[PDB]
Amino acid sequence: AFGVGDDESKVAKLTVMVYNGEQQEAIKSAENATKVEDIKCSAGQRTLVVMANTGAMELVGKTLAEVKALTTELTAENQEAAGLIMTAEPKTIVLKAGKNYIGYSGTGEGNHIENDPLKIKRVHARMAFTEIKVQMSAAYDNIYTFVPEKIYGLIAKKQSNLFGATLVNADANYLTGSLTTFNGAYTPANYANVPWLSRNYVAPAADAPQGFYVLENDYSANGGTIHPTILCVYGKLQKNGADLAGADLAAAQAANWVDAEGKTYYPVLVNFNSNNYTYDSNYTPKNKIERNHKYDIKLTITGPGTNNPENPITESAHLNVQCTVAEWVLVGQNATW
Amino acid sequence: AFGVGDDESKVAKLTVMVYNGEQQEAIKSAENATKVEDIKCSAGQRTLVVMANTGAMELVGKTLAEVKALTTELTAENQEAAGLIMTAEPKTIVLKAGKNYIGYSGTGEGNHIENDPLKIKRVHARMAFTEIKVQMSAAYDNIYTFVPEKIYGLIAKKQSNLFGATLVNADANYLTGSLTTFNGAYTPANYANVPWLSRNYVAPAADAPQGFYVLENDYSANGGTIHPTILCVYGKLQKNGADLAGADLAAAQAANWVDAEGKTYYPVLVNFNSNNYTYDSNYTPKNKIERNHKYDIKLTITGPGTNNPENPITESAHLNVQCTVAEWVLVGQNATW
Amino acid sequence: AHLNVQCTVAEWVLVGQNATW
Amino acid sequence: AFGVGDDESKVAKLTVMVYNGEQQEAIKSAENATKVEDIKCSAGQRTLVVMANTGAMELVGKTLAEVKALTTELTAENQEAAGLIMTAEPKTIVLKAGKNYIGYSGTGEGNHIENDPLKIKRVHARMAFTEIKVQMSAAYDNIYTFVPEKIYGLIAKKQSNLFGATLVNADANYLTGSLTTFNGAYTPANYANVPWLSRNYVAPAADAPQGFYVLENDYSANGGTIHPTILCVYGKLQKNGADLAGADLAAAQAANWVDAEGKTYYPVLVNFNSNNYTYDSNYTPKNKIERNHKYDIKLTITGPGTNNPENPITES
């Protein structure tokens, strides 16, 4: 149940809280709907927060700053598209005496504060493949062939904030569906082999695309190390129809392609702005990942893969040649008999 | 004797007197019965007045002009239903010379003058609690708990008239059984502490209530300032079982909830026509307090109270929120490797 | 001329007030 | 088309490939031109190789250690200037991510690899006659008279390498444009006849020469036995105007001039440093056939010739 569009937008527990300034005054949560009916409170200047799909969390009696600094982390139950926490910003509305309501402009008595319906954005981020097609270059045609096995994502962050402009917090506790043993320049600090982020390869396309849900991350720096949330493919690499064994594992390992079993990796740094990547619809790429974005990618397989998929990517270029023919050398050997 | 049915309607002295125009003619008082025997007087056009349960107060010598402007002030002895001043209206009767009386038509000889027995209102007005049940809301359930100590009422007036159409005059000498230091909007000038209106908390039910006897006051003017008579409950407020201290005691007082010790107020001000109160038997609320009325009130405790009970009250308000979900921001990325 | 007056007493009116906070 | 300068130097196929150590990274070939314009690869440390006129030769997939040991042979196509392999040594360039070009430097954007256009050497060599004028000595004036018939060459080598410095390898499969009947001090063991190294004699001059393309072969040892490359003419030897027969031919066999048919040879050694030869433009001669050289020879007949052209020569 990864991605249908219906389950991506489905509230299950809407919760509205009204404060009078740093103190909990009114709170009443409704379930499996989107209309709230009886939030009784005082009048005057109040602050209005609204959350959805929060699950079983302590929310009674908590103050303003504690609900503004709540943290969630992704579970096993997020990859089946459930428990997607949503959020609007605080907006400090004002209230009249009799009966106030917001949105659905011009229905009954009382008074309307805001005419348009209130918007709530998500907090997750979907990344997925769409196309996986192979096209070997001139230097490997009908020699090396690829078959895919696993599709696991690599450097997914653990936890993030829930309210504000950006969503970052200094808790580097990233999660990984790989061995977490090899270590490139995209350095593993303190990982965890977690059996969620690992799916078997079944039919990637434009309908039901295989992928994962990750939280907000930032790697838009210029110097120092970064931790890009890459997404990779993994599987066996065959040589002219047969499996790689015997007298070619040692030949391949010096070129840094294939692991000791016969497998190889294929990483894609989603939203990274390198020379291998292009973008459609006039999108200048920013070097982070932000909430409410459908990062779907189409890659092309040219040549074999690589070991150590957290190594830095190699950028492409082009060449062209022009040469001249040399001159002869004369001697002129005159002989006599 | 705070009201049994007999200790509050029992005449201790029924003074009755006559007038032939601007000067007295006769007076004779009888005790512990509703009758008088041997008034003697002339015949012709007269004017009859009758007061009851006056007690120690001079009433001889004065004229018709001075008796229509007598003022009484409530004393400390009026809390055991002793000293309830009961009076009537002048009724300009004529008088035949032989023998005539007023009351009990169909008993003796002579001629009756008024057929029904003459009726007498009082001037006081009782206000009392009946049910102080507590039901915390959802936002403070199993967090705050309330226990009452004191019951005192605050802005009762001091003196009034005794005859005429209305009974309220122009005077400001108010009384209060509280700490009376703080100022608010409903705060008149020159009123000080009096230690009569203060009691313990003794199990208030539909039988044997707790309250006071207060006089008349008008606060029906729309603009400007007003001074209504309020009644309050004052008590401790324990946060999660133990005594209130710690980080909350400097946090609750910013919300204007609890005073500088750990105690909370609960005011309710009689006959106001606000959003906060309901009534019954289809009784419209006037904005005053009149004679011969009993005010039994029934509050519930929802949440904490506020300090400074002479502030204007905050009208309640309901709410309805409808929220919609924003859509994805679809980015596209094609990749080469 | 003489006089006898025999008065009665009048009961209150009940005004109930259901309040909330 | 033996020597025009147009057909002698014309790239009928270019082929450019580039490695990253022991594996193939990129490969592309243009045709009938000298420009491959769209090489796509990665960046980093690479090694560049470029070949010309390889023909139908398998170059995809093969590693660097196998490319650096390729061989070739001379063909019948090689004697009319068609199928001349042309290569250069690897030169380990380093690439940049933007755009890199080699040749026509200083004209476009990006950066330059190197300034000059790249040079490609041929692998073959040429040996050819240019002037076969005949002036007999005093002891044969108006007695013997020579006329030529054939032009073939003798001890060309079959195979070689394609990369290195001295691209001669240890093998022995030599070719010959004549008989295997005489066995002098020059004839090697494995030996063969190949009937394309032989034209028929026509009018050599300052232009329109006659000769053969050839590969490279080392015979510079002092002691032991060598195998030098010999070119020759081969023709009748008349006596006093008529054809030679009678009881003089059996008197001519004892001096080993003329064989049983009536003909004689004229062997000449290319680049030999003997007393009988001479040179010009102050050139010391080396005892090997090296790459990309043009050996024009003009000889003067003085006296008759000899049998056994694979015998050692007798200096003056």
Coordinates of C-alpha atoms in Angstrom, one line a residue, chain D residues 37-313:
Chain D
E37 CA 33.7 14.7 -32.3
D38 CA 31.5 13.1 -29.7
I39 CA 33.5 10.9 -27.3
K40 CA 31.5 10.4 -24.1
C41 CA 33.1 8.9 -21.0
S42 CA 33.7 9.7 -17.3
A43 CA 36.3 11.9 -15.7
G44 CA 39.5 11.2 -13.8
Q45 CA 42.8 9.5 -14.8
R46 CA 42.5 7.8 -18.2
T47 CA 44.8 6.4 -20.9
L48 CA 44.2 7.3 -24.6
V49 CA 44.9 5.1 -27.6
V50 CA 44.2 5.9 -31.3
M51 CA 44.5 3.6 -34.3
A52 CA 44.0 3.9 -38.1
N53 CA 43.0 1.5 -40.9
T54 CA 42.7 -1.5 -38.6
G55 CA 39.9 -2.9 -40.9
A56 CA 37.7 -5.7 -39.6
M57 CA 39.6 -6.2 -36.3
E58 CA 37.9 -7.0 -33.0
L59 CA 38.5 -4.0 -30.7
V60 CA 35.5 -4.0 -28.4
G61 CA 35.8 -5.2 -24.8
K62 CA 39.4 -6.2 -24.8
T63 CA 41.6 -5.0 -21.9
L64 CA 44.8 -2.9 -22.1
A65 CA 47.2 -5.7 -21.6
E66 CA 45.7 -7.6 -24.6
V67 CA 45.5 -4.5 -26.8
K68 CA 49.2 -3.8 -26.1
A69 CA 50.1 -7.2 -27.7
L70 CA 48.3 -7.1 -31.0
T71 CA 49.9 -8.4 -34.2
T72 CA 49.5 -8.0 -37.9
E73 CA 50.7 -9.3 -41.3
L74 CA 51.4 -8.0 -44.7
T75 CA 48.7 -8.6 -47.3
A76 CA 48.4 -8.5 -51.0
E77 CA 46.3 -5.3 -50.5
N78 CA 49.3 -3.6 -48.9
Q79 CA 51.3 -3.3 -52.1
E80 CA 48.9 -0.8 -53.7
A81 CA 48.7 1.5 -50.7
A82 CA 45.4 0.4 -49.1
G83 CA 45.3 -1.1 -45.6
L84 CA 48.3 0.7 -43.9
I85 CA 47.9 0.5 -40.2
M86 CA 48.8 3.6 -38.3
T87 CA 49.1 4.1 -34.5
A88 CA 50.7 6.0 -31.7
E89 CA 51.8 5.3 -28.1
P90 CA 49.5 5.8 -25.2
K91 CA 49.9 9.1 -23.5
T92 CA 47.8 9.0 -20.2
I93 CA 45.7 12.2 -20.3
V94 CA 43.7 13.6 -17.4
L95 CA 40.2 14.8 -18.1
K96 CA 38.0 17.6 -16.8
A97 CA 34.2 17.6 -16.3
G98 CA 33.4 20.5 -18.6
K99 CA 34.7 19.8 -22.1
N100 CA 38.1 18.7 -23.4
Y101 CA 39.5 18.6 -26.9
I102 CA 42.9 17.5 -28.4
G103 CA 43.9 19.3 -31.6
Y104 CA 43.1 22.7 -33.1
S105 CA 44.0 24.3 -29.8
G106 CA 43.2 27.8 -28.6
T107 CA 39.9 28.1 -30.5
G108 CA 36.9 27.1 -28.4
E109 CA 35.9 27.2 -24.8
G110 CA 36.8 24.7 -22.1
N111 CA 40.5 23.8 -21.5
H112 CA 43.2 22.3 -23.7
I113 CA 44.7 18.9 -23.3
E114 CA 47.7 19.7 -25.5
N115 CA 48.4 22.2 -28.1
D116 CA 49.7 20.4 -31.2
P117 CA 47.6 18.1 -33.4
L118 CA 48.3 14.4 -32.6
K119 CA 50.9 12.6 -34.7
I120 CA 50.4 9.1 -36.1
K121 CA 53.2 7.0 -37.5
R122 CA 52.7 4.3 -40.2
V123 CA 53.8 0.8 -39.2
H124 CA 55.1 -0.3 -42.7
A125 CA 58.1 0.8 -44.7
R126 CA 59.0 1.1 -48.4
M127 CA 61.8 -0.3 -50.5
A128 CA 61.9 0.6 -54.2
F129 CA 64.2 1.0 -57.2
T130 CA 64.6 4.3 -59.0
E131 CA 67.5 4.0 -61.6
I132 CA 68.8 0.7 -63.0
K133 CA 71.2 2.2 -65.6
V134 CA 73.8 -0.3 -66.9
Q135 CA 77.5 0.6 -67.8
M136 CA 79.7 -2.5 -68.0
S137 CA 83.3 -2.6 -67.0
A138 CA 86.4 -2.6 -69.2
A139 CA 86.7 -6.4 -69.1
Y140 CA 83.2 -6.9 -70.5
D141 CA 82.9 -4.1 -73.1
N142 CA 80.9 -5.3 -76.1
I143 CA 80.9 -8.9 -74.9
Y144 CA 78.1 -9.3 -72.3
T145 CA 74.9 -7.3 -72.3
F146 CA 72.1 -7.3 -69.6
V147 CA 68.3 -6.8 -69.9
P148 CA 65.9 -7.2 -66.9
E149 CA 62.9 -9.4 -66.4
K150 CA 61.6 -9.4 -62.8
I151 CA 61.8 -7.3 -59.7
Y152 CA 61.0 -9.4 -56.6
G153 CA 62.1 -9.1 -53.0
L154 CA 63.4 -11.9 -50.8
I155 CA 63.4 -12.1 -47.0
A156 CA 60.4 -10.0 -45.8
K157 CA 59.1 -11.0 -42.4
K158 CA 55.5 -12.0 -41.8
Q159 CA 54.3 -10.6 -38.4
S160 CA 55.2 -7.9 -35.9
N161 CA 53.8 -6.0 -33.0
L162 CA 51.9 -2.6 -33.1
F163 CA 53.1 -0.8 -30.0
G164 CA 56.4 -0.1 -28.2
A165 CA 59.7 1.2 -29.4
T166 CA 61.4 -1.6 -31.4
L167 CA 58.3 -3.5 -32.5
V168 CA 60.0 -6.7 -33.6
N169 CA 59.0 -9.9 -31.8
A170 CA 60.6 -13.3 -31.5
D171 CA 59.1 -15.3 -34.4
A172 CA 60.2 -16.9 -37.6
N173 CA 57.6 -17.2 -40.4
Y174 CA 59.4 -15.3 -43.2
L175 CA 58.0 -14.8 -46.7
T176 CA 59.8 -14.9 -50.1
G177 CA 58.8 -14.0 -53.6
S178 CA 60.8 -16.9 -55.2
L179 CA 61.8 -20.6 -55.0
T180 CA 62.9 -22.6 -52.0
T181 CA 65.7 -24.4 -53.7
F182 CA 68.9 -22.7 -52.7
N183 CA 70.0 -22.9 -49.0
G184 CA 72.8 -20.4 -48.3
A185 CA 74.0 -19.0 -45.0
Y186 CA 71.0 -16.6 -44.9
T187 CA 68.0 -19.0 -45.3
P188 CA 65.9 -19.4 -42.1
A189 CA 64.1 -22.5 -41.0
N190 CA 60.3 -21.9 -41.5
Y191 CA 60.0 -20.6 -45.0
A192 CA 57.3 -20.0 -47.5
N193 CA 56.6 -18.8 -51.1
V194 CA 54.1 -15.9 -51.5
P195 CA 53.3 -14.8 -55.1
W196 CA 52.4 -11.1 -54.7
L197 CA 55.9 -9.6 -54.0
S198 CA 56.8 -9.6 -57.7
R199 CA 56.0 -7.1 -60.4
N200 CA 57.2 -7.1 -64.0
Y201 CA 59.9 -4.8 -65.1
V202 CA 59.1 -1.4 -66.5
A203 CA 61.1 1.9 -66.9
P204 CA 62.1 3.1 -63.5
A205 CA 63.0 6.8 -63.3
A206 CA 63.0 9.8 -60.9
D207 CA 59.2 9.4 -60.8
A208 CA 57.1 6.2 -61.1
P209 CA 59.3 3.8 -59.0
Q210 CA 58.8 0.1 -58.5
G211 CA 59.1 -1.7 -55.2
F212 CA 57.4 -3.2 -52.2
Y213 CA 56.0 -2.3 -48.8
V214 CA 57.6 -4.3 -46.0
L215 CA 57.6 -4.8 -42.3
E216 CA 60.5 -4.5 -39.8
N217 CA 63.1 -7.1 -39.0
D218 CA 66.3 -7.1 -36.9
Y219 CA 69.5 -8.6 -38.2
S220 CA 72.1 -6.5 -36.5
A221 CA 74.0 -9.3 -34.6
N222 CA 77.7 -9.5 -35.3
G223 CA 78.3 -13.2 -34.8
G224 CA 76.0 -16.1 -35.6
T225 CA 73.6 -16.1 -38.5
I226 CA 71.4 -13.2 -39.6
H227 CA 68.5 -12.8 -42.0
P228 CA 68.7 -9.5 -43.9
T229 CA 66.1 -8.1 -46.3
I230 CA 67.1 -8.4 -49.9
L231 CA 65.6 -6.7 -53.0
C232 CA 66.7 -7.7 -56.4
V233 CA 66.3 -7.7 -60.2
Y234 CA 66.5 -10.8 -62.2
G235 CA 67.3 -11.0 -65.9
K236 CA 68.9 -12.6 -69.0
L237 CA 72.6 -12.3 -69.6
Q238 CA 73.5 -12.2 -73.3
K239 CA 76.9 -12.7 -74.9
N240 CA 77.8 -10.8 -78.0
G241 CA 74.3 -9.7 -78.8
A242 CA 72.6 -13.1 -79.1
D243 CA 71.2 -15.4 -76.5
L244 CA 73.6 -17.4 -74.4
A245 CA 73.7 -21.2 -75.1
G246 CA 76.2 -23.8 -76.3
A247 CA 79.3 -24.9 -74.4
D248 CA 79.7 -21.6 -72.6
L249 CA 76.8 -22.0 -70.2
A250 CA 78.4 -25.1 -68.7
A251 CA 81.5 -22.9 -68.7
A252 CA 79.5 -20.2 -66.9
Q253 CA 78.2 -22.5 -64.2
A254 CA 81.6 -23.1 -62.8
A255 CA 81.9 -19.4 -61.9
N256 CA 78.4 -19.6 -60.4
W257 CA 77.2 -16.7 -62.5
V258 CA 74.1 -18.1 -64.3
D259 CA 71.8 -20.9 -63.3
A260 CA 70.5 -23.7 -65.6
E261 CA 67.8 -21.6 -67.3
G262 CA 69.9 -18.7 -68.6
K263 CA 69.2 -15.9 -66.1
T264 CA 71.0 -14.2 -63.3
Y265 CA 70.2 -12.3 -60.1
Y266 CA 71.3 -9.0 -58.6
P267 CA 70.8 -8.9 -54.9
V268 CA 71.0 -5.7 -52.9
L269 CA 70.7 -5.4 -49.1
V270 CA 68.7 -2.6 -47.7
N271 CA 70.5 -0.6 -44.9
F272 CA 73.5 -2.9 -44.6
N273 CA 76.8 -0.9 -44.1
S274 CA 79.0 -3.0 -46.4
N275 CA 81.9 -1.7 -48.6
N276 CA 80.0 -2.2 -51.8
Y277 CA 77.3 0.3 -51.0
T278 CA 77.5 4.0 -50.4
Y279 CA 75.1 6.7 -49.2
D280 CA 74.5 10.4 -49.3
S281 CA 73.5 13.4 -47.2
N282 CA 75.9 12.1 -44.5
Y283 CA 73.8 9.2 -43.2
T284 CA 75.3 6.5 -41.2
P285 CA 73.4 3.2 -41.9
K286 CA 71.8 1.1 -39.2
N287 CA 71.7 -2.7 -39.7
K288 CA 67.9 -3.0 -39.2
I289 CA 64.7 -2.1 -41.0
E290 CA 63.0 0.4 -38.7
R291 CA 59.5 2.0 -38.9
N292 CA 58.2 4.6 -41.4
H293 CA 61.2 4.8 -43.7
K294 CA 61.5 5.2 -47.5
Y295 CA 64.5 3.3 -49.0
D296 CA 65.0 4.4 -52.6
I297 CA 67.8 2.5 -54.4
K298 CA 69.6 3.1 -57.6
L299 CA 72.2 0.5 -58.7
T300 CA 74.8 0.4 -61.5
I301 CA 75.5 -3.0 -63.1
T302 CA 79.2 -3.7 -63.5
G303 CA 79.9 -7.2 -64.7
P304 CA 77.5 -10.1 -64.5
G305 CA 75.6 -11.4 -61.4
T306 CA 75.5 -14.5 -59.3
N307 CA 73.3 -17.4 -58.4
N308 CA 72.1 -18.0 -54.8
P309 CA 70.9 -14.5 -53.9
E310 CA 70.7 -15.7 -50.3
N311 CA 74.5 -16.1 -50.1
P312 CA 76.7 -13.6 -48.3
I313 CA 78.0 -10.8 -50.5

